[PDB]
Ligand binder design. Structure first.
Ligand SMILES: C[C@H]1[C@H](C)CC[C@]2(C(=O)O)CC[C@]3(C)C(=CC[C@@H]4[C@@]5(C)C[C@@H](O)[C@H](O)[C@@](C)(CO)[C@@H]5CC[C@]43C)[C@H]12
Ligand SMILES: C[C@H]1[C@H](C)CC[C@]2(C(=O)O)CC[C@]3(C)C(=CC[C@@H]4[C@@]5(C)C[C@@H](O)[C@H](O)[C@@](C)(CO)[C@@H]5CC[C@]43C)[C@H]12
Lengths: 813, 813
């Protein structure tokens, strides 16, 4: 149908149809008489997977011959989503498969809906890992993603009586056609035991062994025939495990629980032992694999060359144990002296920080590490001692600096600060947006920055234009390609060329037409899947992201109620109709986040069934927000809500997805919003609220929520409604916690941004009344979204941290 | 190479080679540079599996169109062994694959050694199930095997310091290419809950749900293009399971433990709850599947026709809950009246008894069934009440009969007698050999036989000539085929024709040549795999079977020691050299069986390193006895030890394997030994010891072991050696338990058969000195082994129990 989806040429279509039928028959053991859409999905998935393997094998062949520097991206989360359409796109197979499936009497889009999300992440951090893998393959880097194959990913969210229910995400039930089990490359991981000292140094003995089994998933580059590997470790009991007899066999489960389930916490630390085991598990298996690969190369005994052959990137502090683990292997097993092992470690490792929120920082109780990893604690103490000697020598007499910079935190319970560990043992530390990187240098890591200024960098986050434009928004990609060609897909800066079309009447019409189609499709999705009715002519006001206080879903809630109260005051006045959509998961133990979800639904219960309101205001909670739901709602959005308190959202990536897909952004000067507004021009953005400086000023003076309550009658009315049970008639005091928090213990100053936010929202409504000017502003956003491609981000990592050159060159097919 | 292995015709060899390479590349994602033999095995296994699916699909198609009566074989054990060679044989692919793999530079035999045994059974009962499935497919029956897919089968046995160590049989580690997961056909199984009574009868409520997921494995008939199904159920937690959050996800393991591990007890009952859950699990899932298939047929609401469309065979009492479960479904769910449901149940079910040993009988505590299956206990009480009313009416006033026949056993703990349940609810009850079936009618089920004589039958066990001749002994199958053709493979009675070759000098030479080759190959296997040295010219004296007291491995031990002591007394006298091989697993908690294994190795420690003995006597314990080890040692055997106390071994099947493969049999008149001797003639068998009558006489008088000790000096010497630490110098009293048991509490009267056994063993040695007469006796055995084909057994089940006609007719290819 459309150009950007590739050629559907007779020879390919015929070959695809016959391999489809081969897989249906031989692989699935079905025929057309019994086959369900699921069977049809699998036959297609197997047919497409076949196209990868040749490229996969020769890519890995190429790296063996050329022996380039290898990039190892260590993350506990890879939020991949669906793989079918992404593979077709990157392989140029999408039209051919559409044709082949059409001719077999099947709708490919219906088949795509059957694939489970690989939901092995929580949100931003996990999805960044996924975008990174795509870009690394697209840029020809010899890169590997290493993580854990969780049996259960992020929970499926069900709304019941307005409340979140969690159910297990059993994503492997029907199988995963993309992975290849590699039991032959299984590796032992050690836990517990004790440390023995000898003439030949320390020995870690009497350990419990857990086996790590790798599963490989292909990662295709965009149209370059590069297929990299994501290797995920699964936990297996050894066969002499416990070995009355029955119980010993049943207790094998204990070892295998390590890889059972993803911890569902977004930006929040929980000091649980199982979590620490997961962290060491991925680190120990990966490092052995890295070293084995280093030794078995065309180059090489000599660990001097290690940093020239290996880069290890730590996605947050979750794989921070890679630092003492690498030291352990180099010192205890390879017999290098401390100072040489340490130079190698620092030159190999690099650390990316994702948040400044104190409750998100990993600080592990010493007594946990003592029991679980006795050798690693010793190495940590020794790293600390030598590091503190460097601080003492640089800042003599500064005793408070010493306690501030220590990796060991003193208190009732002694803790290891994992972020401090990462800084000390990495040659590079980066934040994920310019303002976030500055905040690190000025506040939380100020001391470390004064010691080693050269270590600190910025790498502003990015999103992949393949998944986040071509895949999810084919209509928009097509109208862009008509004017400027296809090269922008792997060089997103080229979208600037679209600025010379901002006054083009045909393009304006097309941009606005694609948005309307997207909105109509999504409104249909809501009716068919969730039996909910929305007006596709209203402004689609969308806030989708994890439910957190700092993300201020509550600020949005306050606006929504203001609009309702204004309508009820002046019913016969014209207002721009809105559909307000809020979506996101709450961590299971996060009580406040669960309350906010209930409020949102409770608001919808009042607003959606008020006859006076009509179709002018709708409030919808988007259930089970995840990657494949994002691919649908983002192209359909008019307004992107990015309203975190200034200085709390390190970067955001949702913000970029919306910019790329033709929504306008209302937001604070937080995270990457600042860089986005800078790229588009502040006139093309709806910026409101306190800057970082204003927050600090308010903190010094003290934040008093009562002040705003007293001076803003519209705010008072809302609080009285919440308190008196207007939104919960059966349980009048249901929302006492929310009101209490807002009035007395609001860390995120919801009320302080209320007035500016509401006023700015009026300016949004005003612009929406003039479709031509709205669309021209939209075009100005899309055209300047180029910088926020993860290809740019990854090229910066490659050049400034890893010391490798990106390549756009094809491998032979 | 050999005729019986099929054609290696240019077109087939070329097609096999290319599909091998296709699977290596696309399925395994390997190439010739990295591939190991394991990779080569899998590529072959996938290539062969491809040949099944077409036949598999059209067989199931055929049954849908014709709608024949369906046979359901319910067993908790299917001891399948390896599948590759068996599939090639039954498909006529063996020479073609040998050729194709040869031309790729691979040795197929080396590749076959890589396949894990599917060891989902303990011994006789489990292996009978496997032979039955082969024969049912070979005879064109619409038959299904239903069981449990254990994650861990029978443990691997390691010998350490002479002692058995058990390790987990992780047979699925590298995957199973034969099975096809069918998650779409998952079924709920209910546990616990309570019974509620209404107007519309009883309701089972508040149950815990466990999901049963089926895995299908193809079962090919011999050269007839019939491919039946073995369906094995795997336990899965439902997704709302328990649903703090983490723990709820981890506790999903509890539900899934149901299918985790096979209970390693051969002929012994253990009243564990997990075992009862397994039993109900397979029964509930299978019955739902049977009923669903019955309703969705070309025939049919009307359960009158159920017994015309369905036969359910119960392999022992392990699936006995099928009886109250079928009643439950018919009465509670389908709303049939009791009497009609009961008529349908009895006409549907049939029961096969496998042992008379009291400790093997399943007698479940009422309090277990009360908690786990409250509705089934009620149905059991009601079945019992109505059954006891029938007994009272037939034998008025006979109050002791009533208590004897009751399904409910009274005592400290009330128990359900599952065998009694099976007899009451089945139209047919059979033993597994003629003497065993008589013992049932005369002793343990005498009361039931007097009530319903028409219910009691014999079906003498059989073994499959495909696995147990063609597959494991190609050399012998070939020399037989040269004389009489190939038709005997699916009609084993034709082996009688070989009687006219008993005086043929060429045939005698060939039979003896094949045995020598078999012995040389096995002696080489022992050196290569276990670094043990045997003389291939000695008589191979072999006892392989589960380690049990009733099987009397100890009697064998006593002979072995007698031979040693005689040699040491008269060193320079000629004796026929023997290699005595004993093999078998002991149940982990069976202390005595573990002691016997230690004795056997302890004997070998003394005998094998006595220079005076030389190569005249060797005692070897065969480690990890299992199906694939049987396929190797059985063709290599000269003497088959079948020496159970008369009346204890219900049938035996090992005995038949040895007869078919050219060993002579020394044994008691026990089980099927009686029928074997009858077929060959007693002159061609080494029969010794008490008959059943003699045992009974000895029991009445009382068995006094001291009597034999006093009157047999050779026996006394052995006991003194055991007591004084001759066979355990470091631990002189190591064998006190064995001596004590022999002297004071021997249920199996080892000493009573000692003299006759030793004397008979001398007659065996005498015959072995004359190779020509030994071989002529061998030929007389092989030629009369026809009756012991499971094709015969299965045809008898089909005609006399199930009411279906066997067919040798091909399906179109
Ligand atoms: C040496 C092993 C090690 C035992 C485990 C880690 C290893 C790795 O580097 O990831 C596993 C994979 C192989 C076997 C490895 C190395 C090379 C091959 C290779 C590229 C070799 C090549 O000749 C084959 O054609 C091809 C291209 C194809 O078989 C292979 C692909 C597989 C690798 C990369 C590694
Ligand atoms: C009705 C279902 C039920 C939902 C679950 C149990 C069932 C069974 O009888 O075992 C599952 C298998 C199918 C779907 C079943 C029935 C028929 C098919 C069938 C023989 C149908 C035939 O047209 C196909 O060509 C073929 C021959 C091929 O698709 C099928 C094969 C599969 C069966 C036998 C059963």
């Amino acid at each position: 149908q459309i150009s950007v989806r590739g050629l559907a040429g007779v020879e390919n279509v015929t070959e695809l149809k016959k391999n489809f039928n081969r897989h249906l028959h031989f692989t699935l053991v079905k025929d057309r008489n019994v086959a369900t859409p699921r069977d049809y999905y699998f036959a297609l998935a197997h047919t497409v997977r076949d196209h990868l393997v040749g490229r996969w094998i020769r890519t890995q062949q190429h790296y063996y011959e050329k022996d380039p520097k290898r990039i190892y991206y260590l993350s506990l989360e890879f939020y991949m989503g669906r793989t079918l359409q992404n593979t077709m796109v990157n392989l140029a197979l999408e039209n051919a498969c559409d044709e082949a499936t059409y001719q077999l009497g099947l709708d490919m889009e219906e088949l795509e809906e059957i694939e489970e999300d690989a939901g092995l992440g929580n949100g931003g951090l996990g999805r960044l890992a996924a975008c990174f893998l795509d870009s690394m393959a697209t840029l020809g880097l010899a890169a590997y993603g290493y993580g854990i194959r969780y049996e259960f990913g992020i929970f499926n969210q069900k709304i019941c009586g307005g409340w979140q229910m969690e159910e297990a995400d059993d994503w492997l039930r029907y199988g995963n056609p993309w992975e290849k089990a590699r039991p032959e490359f299984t590796l032992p991981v050690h836990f517990y035991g004790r440390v023995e000292h000898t003439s030949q140094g320390a020995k870690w003995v009497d350990t419990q062994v857990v086996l790590a089994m790798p599963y490989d998933t292909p990662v295709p580059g965009y149209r370059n025939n590069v297929v990299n590997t994501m290797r995920l470790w699964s936990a297996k009991a050894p066969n002499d495990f416990n070995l009355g007899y029955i119980q010993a066999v049943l207790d094998r489960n204990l070892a295998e629980n390590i890889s059972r389930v993803l911890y569902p916490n977004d930006n929040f630390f929980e000091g649980k032992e199982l979590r620490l085991k997961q962290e060491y598990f991925v680190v120990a298996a990966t490092l052995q694999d890295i070293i084995r690969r280093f030794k078995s190369s065309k180059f090489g005994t000599n660990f001097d060359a290690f940093p020239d052959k290996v880069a290890i990137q730590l996605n947050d502090t979750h794989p921070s144990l890679a630092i003492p683990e690498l030291m352990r292997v180099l010192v205890d097993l390879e017999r290098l002296d401390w100072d040489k092992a340490w130079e190698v470690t620092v030159k190999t490792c690099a650390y990316t920080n994702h948040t400044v929120l104190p409750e998100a920082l990993e600080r592990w109780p010493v007594h946990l590490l003592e029991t679980l990893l006795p050798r690693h604690l010793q190495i940590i103490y020794e790293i600390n001692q030598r590091f503190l000697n460097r601080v003492a020598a640089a800042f003599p007499g500064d005793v408070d600096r010493l306690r501030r910079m220590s990796l060991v935190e003193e208190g009732a319970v002694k803790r290891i600060n994992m972020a401090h560990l990462c800084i000390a043992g990495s040659h590079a530390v980066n934040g994920v947006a310019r303002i976030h990187s500055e905040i690190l240098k000025k506040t939380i890591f100020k001391d470390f920055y004064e010691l080693e200024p050269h270590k600190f960098q910025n790498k502003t986050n990015g999103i992949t234009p393949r998944r986040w434009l071509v895949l999810c928004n084919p209509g928009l990609a097509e109208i862009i390609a008509e004017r400027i060609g296809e090269e922008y897909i792997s060089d997103l800066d080229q979208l600037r060329k679209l600025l010379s079309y901002v006054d083009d009447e045909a393009f304006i019409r097309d941009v606005a037409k694609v948005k309307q189609e997207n909105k109509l499709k999504f409104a249909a999705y809501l009716e068919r899947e969730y039996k909910v009715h929305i007006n596709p002519n209203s402004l689609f006001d969308v806030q989708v992201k994890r439910i957190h206080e700092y993300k201020r879903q509550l600020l949005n809630c306050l606006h929504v109620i203001t609009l309702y109260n204004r309508i009820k005051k002046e019913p016969n006045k014209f207002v721009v109709p809105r559909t307000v959509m809020i979506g996101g998961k709450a961590a299971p133990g996060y009580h406040m986040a669960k309350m906010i979800i209930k409020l949102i639904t409770a608001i919808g219960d009042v607003v959606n069934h008020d006859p006076v309101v009509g179709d002018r205001l709708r409030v919808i909670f988007l259930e089970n927000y995840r990657v494949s739901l994002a691919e649908k709602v983002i192209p359909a959005a008019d307004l992107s809500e990015q309203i975190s308190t200034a200085g709390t959202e390190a970067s955001g990536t949702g913000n970029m997805k919306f910019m790329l897909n033709g929504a306008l952004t209302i937001g604070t000067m937080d995270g990457a919003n600042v860089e986005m507004a800078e790229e588009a021009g502040e006139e093309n953005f709806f910026i409101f609220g306190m800057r970082v400086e204003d927050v600090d000023r308010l903190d010094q003076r003290g934040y008093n929520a009562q002040e705003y309550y007293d001076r803003i009658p519209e705010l008072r009315q809302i609080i009285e409604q919440l308190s008196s049970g207007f939104f919960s008639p059966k349980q009048p005091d249901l929302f006492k916690d929310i009101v209490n928090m807002l009035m007395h213990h609001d860390r995120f100053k919801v009320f302080a941004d209320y007035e500016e936010y509401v006023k700015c929202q009026e300016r949004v409504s005003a612009l929406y009344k003039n479709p031509r000017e709205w669309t021209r502003m939209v075009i100005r956003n899309i055209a300047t979204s180029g910088k926020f491609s993860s290809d740019r981000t990854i090229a910066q990592y490659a050049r400034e941290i890893w010391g490798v050159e990106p390549s756009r060159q094809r491998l032979p097919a």
